[PDB]
Amino acid sequence: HHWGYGKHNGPEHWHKDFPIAKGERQSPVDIDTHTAKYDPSLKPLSVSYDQATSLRILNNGHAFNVEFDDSQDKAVLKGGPLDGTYRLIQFHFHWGSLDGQGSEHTVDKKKYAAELHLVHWNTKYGDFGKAVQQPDGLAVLGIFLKVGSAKPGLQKVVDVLDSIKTKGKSADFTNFDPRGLLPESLDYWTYPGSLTTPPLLECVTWIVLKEPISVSSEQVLKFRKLNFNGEGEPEELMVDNWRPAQPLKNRQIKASFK
Ligand SMILES: NS(=O)(=O)c1ccc(CCNC(=O)N2CC(=O)N3CCc4ccccc4[C@@H]3C2)cc1
Numbered sequence: 001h002h003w004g005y006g007k008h009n010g011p012e013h014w015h016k017d018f019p020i021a022k023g024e025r026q027s028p029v030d031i032d033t034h035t036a037k038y039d040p041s042l043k044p045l046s047v048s049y050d051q052a053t054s055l056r057i058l059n060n061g062h063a064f065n066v067e068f069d070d071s072q073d074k075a076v077l078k079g080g081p082l083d084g085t086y087r088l089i090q091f092h093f094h095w096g097s098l099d100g101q102g103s104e105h106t107v108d109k110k111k112y113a114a115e116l117h118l119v120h121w122n123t124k125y126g127d128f129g130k131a132v133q134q135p136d137g138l139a140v141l142g143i144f145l146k147v148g149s150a151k152p153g154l155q156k157v158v159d160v161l162d163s164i165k166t167k168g169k170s171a172d173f174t175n176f177d178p179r180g181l182l183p184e185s186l187d188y189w190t191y192p193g194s195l196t197t198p199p200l201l202e203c204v205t206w207i208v209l210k211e212p213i214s215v216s217s218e219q220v221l222k223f224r225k226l227n228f229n230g231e232g233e234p235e236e237l238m239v240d241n242w243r244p245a246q247p248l249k250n251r252q253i254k255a256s257f258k
């Protein structure tokens, strides 16, 4: 009886196995744009993905992850609110059953069709597993998706999804350039938070870009054909794999922009 996003094992149940679900710095949150304050102390954000080496794409039963070689400082996130160097290890998405829901963060309570999370770990902790035990261990770059024009840089991901339909399937996924998933502007909001899936560890500096990327209806329809189940199990479509907004508590959301 494992956690998931069904009626019986969804986010409202997670606190029974993971009591930190009701903690002081949980994610995601609603970003109230009128309350977020410009912070002139934020240093410029540095997304350096030119040498990123993707390896594999995996259906883990909760989402699909594109994994990177993180055994040296090829693809790194620095600057903004961050101290030191954060290495890209994987990206994944959260999405809905309908275009009006799917994002984890919300903006003035608006839900987007989907949300991309580029996950990075603080190299001062040596490995990912040590980093998630630290309050500044991870930096997640969050990017909203809205349905409109196709995103050409997403199509290589969309076209491999038929090969990883079910939980536990993986496929080789080399030479994918995550620069193709970024919006034009790097203006962002930032706050201290958590993983949005169990174990819900409070280890993340969140950096949420203001400008959404546009994907086509056909692109997101292909996400919604994935399965939560393994092969040879009853088919359950992988949709609505998002955690709703959590209490902000004793936190301030800071804006990089005026
Ligand atoms: N919604 S979210 O962005 O808040 C979110 C981000 C991250 C996570 C943790 C997901 N776990 C992971 O991504 N894992 C776990 C791991 O132990 N390893 C071993 C180290 C290694 C080496 C190479 C590639 C991949 C891993 C994986 C990464 C959960 C949720």
Ligand SMILES: [Zn+2]
Pocket: 092, 093, 094, 117, 196
């Ligand atoms: Zn995520």
